Structures are given as structure tokens and as C-alpha cells.
């Protein structure tokens, strides 16, 4: 079975930035990939639609997915509030890596990040589970509205998301 492709359509201050297309590596991390896929489609009754990129740091990563507290302290997975680190097989190889945000070991929920640089120091600490395959330019636009603290200069909103099937 082919790896799922999913999308995020992103606004800045109500103005469309475009579409990010992500391949989820369900072959290597099936459980982590399925959580993200299901949060994109909303099929458990909750997910990413309408939530924000709440922490964006230039030359590091763009972080999103806290649809419960919208500030980096929340989120939940389709398995429960948190689920374990599935494996650390895939590595933070460069820009475009899609990886799980966490608050330490075995705290995956819904928050995720897209790298804008090789973040190798996160290897073995954050579960990588996909990669940008179209729309890296959009990711760079998101990055342009970040700051050193991560606070965004514009409201960055995932206005739609889903699975490309
Ligand atoms: C409950 C839950 C479940 C799943 C995910 C999450 C998100 C998770 N919430 C948090 O921890 C906190 C703490 C808290 C409070 C209440 C409940 C739970 C936790 C709240 C949000 C703000 N909060 C801390 C940070 O912001 C932390 C930054 C950090 O960990 N600082 C170290 C160096 C940096 C790097 O390497 N910086 C390089 C800078 O180079 C700039 C170049 N120009 N590492 C990082 O950011 C590591 C990293 C990596 C990817 C994604 C996220 C994160 C951080 N995890 C968070 O945000 C929370």
C-alpha cells in the first residue's frame, strides 16, 4: 500500500499562502503516520482544520497542531492524549522533514513541525514520519513570519487540510 499524501492549506492574516503537500511514511512509522492522516481528515471528530502554526523560528522549524490550547501546551492524538515514540528510524535530514513535536519521551499528541534546516540534534528525540513533497515555498513563507522567540508576526492558520486520494 502506497504512503498517504495529505495537505495543509495555509493563510497568513486571512490571505492564502498556498498548499503544502506531505508524504507520510506509513511504511516505516505506520502508527504515527495514521495519527497525522486522521487528524488531517478529521475522521475521529477533531483535527487540524482551523488550527495555527503557533511557533515558527527562522532557520529552524515551523510548528503547529495544538488545536486544544493553541499555544504549544496541548493537543491530543487519535489514540489518547499522548502516545509513545514509535521508533526513531527516520532522521532529521534537512529542510522539509515532518516530525512530531513533544514535551519529552513518549508525549506525542497532535503537535508537529516542518523543518526549514537540517535539525540533526533532534535525532532520536523526535519521531520523524514524513516530508514535504510540494509547497516548500509555502513553508518558507510561513517561516518568514516567525521570529527568534517563535511568536508569529501574522496569524498563520491551517484553513483546510485532508488526504489527497
Ligand atoms: C504537551 C505537549 C505535547 C506534545 C508537544 C508539545 C510541544 C512542546 N511544548 C513545550 O515544550 C512547552 C513546555 C510545556 C508546557 C506545558 C505542557 C507541556 C510542555 C510549551 C510550549 C512552549 N515550549 C515549551 C517551547 O517552545 C520549548 C522549546 C524547547 O524545547 N527549547 C529547547 C531548544 C530547541 C532548539 O533546539 N532550538 C534551536 C533554535 O535555533 C534557532 C535558529 N535561528 N528545541 C525545541 O524547540 C524542541 C522542539 C522541536 C520541535 C518541535 C517542538 C519542540 C519543543 N516542544 C514543544 O514546544 C507539548
Author numbering: 1 to 165
Text taken from the publication that reported this structure:
Cyclophilin D (CypD) is unique as a mitochondrial cyclophilin and a key regulator of the mitochondrial permeability transition pore (mPTP), a transient channel on the inner mitochondrial membrane that opens under oxidative stress or high mitochondrial matrix calcium levels. A key structural feature shared among all cyclophilin isoforms is a shallow and highly conserved PPIase active site. Adjacent to the active site is the S2 pocket, a distinct exo-site that forms part of a long substrate-binding groove for peptides. In particular, three gatekeeper residues (positions 123, 124, and 145 in CypD) and one far S2 pocket residue (position 118 in CypD) are highly diverse among cyclophilins.
